Amino acid sequence: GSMSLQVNLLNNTFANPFMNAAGVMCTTTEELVAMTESASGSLVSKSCTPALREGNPTPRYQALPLGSINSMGLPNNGFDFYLAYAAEQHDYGKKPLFLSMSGLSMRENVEMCKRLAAVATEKGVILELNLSVAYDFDAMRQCLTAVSEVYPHSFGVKMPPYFDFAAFDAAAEILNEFPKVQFITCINSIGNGLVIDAETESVVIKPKQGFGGLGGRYVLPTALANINAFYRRCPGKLIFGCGGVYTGEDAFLHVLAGASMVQVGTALQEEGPSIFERLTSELLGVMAKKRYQTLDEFRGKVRTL
Amino acid sequence: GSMSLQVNLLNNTFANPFMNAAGVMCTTTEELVAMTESASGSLVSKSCTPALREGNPTPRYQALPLGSINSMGLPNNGFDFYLAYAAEQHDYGKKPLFLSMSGLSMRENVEMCKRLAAVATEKGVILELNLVAYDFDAMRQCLTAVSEVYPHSFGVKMPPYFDFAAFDAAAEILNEFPKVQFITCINSIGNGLVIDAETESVVIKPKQGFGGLGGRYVLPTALANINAFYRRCPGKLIFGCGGVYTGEDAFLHVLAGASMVQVGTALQEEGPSIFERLTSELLGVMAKKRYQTLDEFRGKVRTL
Numbered sequence: 001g002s003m004s005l006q007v008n009l010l011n012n013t014f015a016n017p018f019m020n021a022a023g024v025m026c027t028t029t030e031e032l033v034a035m036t037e038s039a040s041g042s043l044v045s046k047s048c049t050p051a052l053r054e055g056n057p058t059p060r061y062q063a064l065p066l067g068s069i070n071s072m073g074l075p076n077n078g079f080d081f082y083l084a085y086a087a088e089q090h091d092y093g094k095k096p097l098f099l100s101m102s103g104l105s106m107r108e109n110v111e112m113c114k115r116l117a118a119v120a121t122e123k124g125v126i127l128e129l130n131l132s133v134a135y136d137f138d139a140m141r142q143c144l145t146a147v148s149e150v151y152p153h154s155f156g157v158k159m160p161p162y163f164d165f166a167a168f169d170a171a172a173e174i175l176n177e178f179p180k181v182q183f184i185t186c187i188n189s190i191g192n193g194l195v196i197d198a199e200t201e202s203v204v205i206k207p208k209q210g211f212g213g214l215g216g217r218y219v220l221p222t223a224l225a226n227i228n229a230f231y232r233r234c235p236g237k238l239i240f241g242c243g244g245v246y247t248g249e250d251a252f253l254h255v256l257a258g259a260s261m262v263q264v265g266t267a268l269q270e271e272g273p274s275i276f277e278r279l280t281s282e283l284l285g286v287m288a289k290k291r292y293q294t295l296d297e298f299r300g301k302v303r304t305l
Numbered sequence: 306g307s308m309s310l311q312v313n314l315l316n317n318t319f320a321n322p323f324m325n326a327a328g329v330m331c332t333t334t335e336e337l338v339a340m341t342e343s344a345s346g347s348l349v350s351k352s353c354t355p356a357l358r359e360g361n362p363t364p365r366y367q368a369l370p371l372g373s374i375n376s377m378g379l380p381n382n383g384f385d386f387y388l389a390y391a392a393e394q395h396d397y398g399k400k401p402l403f404l405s406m407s408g409l410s411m412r413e414n415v416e417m418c419k420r421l422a423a424v425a426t427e428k429g430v431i432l433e434l435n436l437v438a439y440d441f442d443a444m445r446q447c448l449t450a451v452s453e454v455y456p457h458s459f460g461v462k463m464p465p466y467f468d469f470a471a472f473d474a475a476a477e478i479l480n481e482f483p484k485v486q487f488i489t490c491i492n493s494i495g496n497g498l499v500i501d502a503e504t505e506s507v508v509i510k511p512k513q514g515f516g517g518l519g520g521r522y523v524l525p526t527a528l529a530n531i532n533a534f535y536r537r538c539p540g541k542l543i544f545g546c547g548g549v550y551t552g553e554d555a556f557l558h559v560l561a562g563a564s565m566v567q568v569g570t571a572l573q574e575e576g577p578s579i580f581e582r583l584t585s586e587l588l589g590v591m592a593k594k595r596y597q598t599l600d601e602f603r604g605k606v607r608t609l
């Protein structure tokens with residue numbers, strides 16, 4: 001039987017649902033080019049601030065048997081750099097491009113969005129706004145109101161994980177007020193875990209006394225929960241999954257929970273962009289064994305008891 | 306060299322830091338007896354409500370490669386039952402006893418505490434109050450209400466927090482209450498969703514498959530919370546809970562700041578015999594590292 005990983009959304013066609021997670025292998029020109037050349041369906045640029053940032057002292061990332069911990073500190077080449085990539089360099093013939101934005105204040109987001117507008121219009125780059133801010137529902141509302149007010153396009157929002165239905169309801173209520181928010185990416189890292197190495201009797205990253213965001217196998221059930229929670233509560237919007245994807249089977253779970261696109265962080269950091277060839281092959285293999293032809297056939301169809 | 310896992314706190318001596326996590330293998334008389342007969346340093350009774358509760362429909366617990374997911378729904382024998390165990394049955398000669406309380410309202414906790422007071426005085430049972438803790442005003446009000454009617458030290462079981470603003474706010478509140486002498490970190494990571502790829506379904510019945518996560522999933526979160534409160538509440542002790550399967554895991558809890566170490570998922574899967582293994586393993590770890598007592602490394606995790 002004929003089978004396809006194609007995704008159609010945001011006025012774009014994607015060969016497959018896979019892309020990098022913001023922050024992973026998408027900071028430099030070489031990384032952005034490598035992502036574009038890869039088998040991924042899309043890519044997103046490193047979350048940017050108005051000016052270049054060095055980020056936190058090293059070590060600031062550690063791979064772990066069950067995932068990763070990091071406190072990168074937003075090291076990035078600055079907004080001008082990513083805007084120029086989107087405007088002059090990216091080959092839109094190959095795949096669509098998302099640009100991740102993480103201003104350190106409302107003002108910074110407003111000023112960057114005003115400049116992004118023209119490039120989105122002319123080239124088709126799509127904004128993923130990083131709110132992970134989102135544990136303060138008032139700050140989240142203010143951020144979104146400001147961006148919505150000045151940015152004349154649809155966009156998406158990258159969310160931190162929530163852990164109770166009251167939070168899911170409060171966040172969904174806010175997101176649903178903004179028609180321009182067309183996708184929601186669930187999730188950013190599980191915040192402020194602490195990895196201790198028994199051998200060294202020490203933490204494993206330098207910033208913040210060793211506290212850092214968790215990714216990888218640790219976060220998969222939390223990611224699936226958030227994907228599904230917002231899938232249910234925001235029926236007018238698309239959900240992008242992010243968290244714990246190492247295999248085609250993991251990706252299948254994201255889609256079953258409601259994901260349209262599937263982002264890959266920790267596993268990509270460890271394996272490099274060749275991972276996308278493996279993931280597409282594996283996801284097709286999973287669909288073959290389960291007798292599915294397209295993603296629409298099972299997206300959001302997780303069975304409850 | 307002579308080693309010791311002894312812990313001394315709240316006017317009690319504990320043979321070792323290990324105990325069950327509230328909710329795991331401590332609902333029935335049979336379970337409470339088995340925990341008392343085990344090699345554990347202590348035990349805590351199932352979180353209780355004023356009256357018995359049947360809990361949520363089954364399946365409501367599932368063991369997983371990396372831990373567990375559950376939505377039990379507070380199935381418990383009711384406060385009178387656990388009070389009677391504490392008052393009339395428990396052999397305090399064997400080990401100290403904690404009683405976990407989880408009223409569904411502030412008034413319920415107040416009324417239970419008024420009655421617990423006399424038994425705490427007479428027999429020495431220690432309250433672990435299951436916290437409402439994502440709402441700091443509510444938490445302060447609850448602790449005020451309980452403190453007013455309960456003339457003893459007690460501890461609080463906390464959900465995990467995920468940022469320093471929350472660690473700071475929670476710590477500030479707990480520090481307002483001198484009667485709160487220990488903080489247990491952590492309860493489950495809330496409302497995860499496990500999906501079985503084979504069945505294309507969730508694995509528990511209540512709440513559309515959403516449930517609390519325990520086990521390997523939660524260890525770095527538990528360590529973070531243990532250490533965050535260890536640092537911010539220097540006048541209190543911290544009890545660790547989350548992701549303990551081995552003596553090495555316990556070693557990490559203690560390095561982060563834990564005095565007692567609670568075992569949930571791993572105990573559910575292995576039974577009370579786990580405590581013999583854990584005491585043996587922790588002593589092995591300590592011998593390899595040349596530590597004789599837990600005081601020598603409690604809270605001493607090195608930062609970079």
Ligand SMILES: Cc1cc2nc3c(=O)[nH]c(=O)nc-3n(C[C@H](O)[C@H](O)[C@H](O)COP(=O)(O)O)c2cc1C
Nearest residue numbers: 021022023047187188189215216243244264265266
């Ligand atoms: C080294 C590193 C850098 C990251 N940078 C960003 C970032 O700039 N913006 C962002 O929204 N998320 C960032 N994240 C979070 C990832 O996008 C992703 O949400 C998280 O790692 C969970 O996915 P995973 O389990 O596939 O790693 C970063 C994660 C890592 C490990």
Ligand SMILES: Cc1cc2nc3c(=O)[nH]c(=O)nc-3n(C[C@H](O)[C@H](O)[C@H](O)COP(=O)(O)O)c2cc1C
Nearest residue numbers: 326327328352491492493519520547548568569570
């Ligand atoms: C089946 C089950 C029942 C539980 N019941 C309670 C409870 O009644 N009160 C409570 O404070 N925590 C309860 N918990 C949470 C545990 O006490 C513990 O905080 C959590 O499982 C993390 O520890 P672990 O990683 O060792 O499982 C329960 C956990 C499980 C799996």
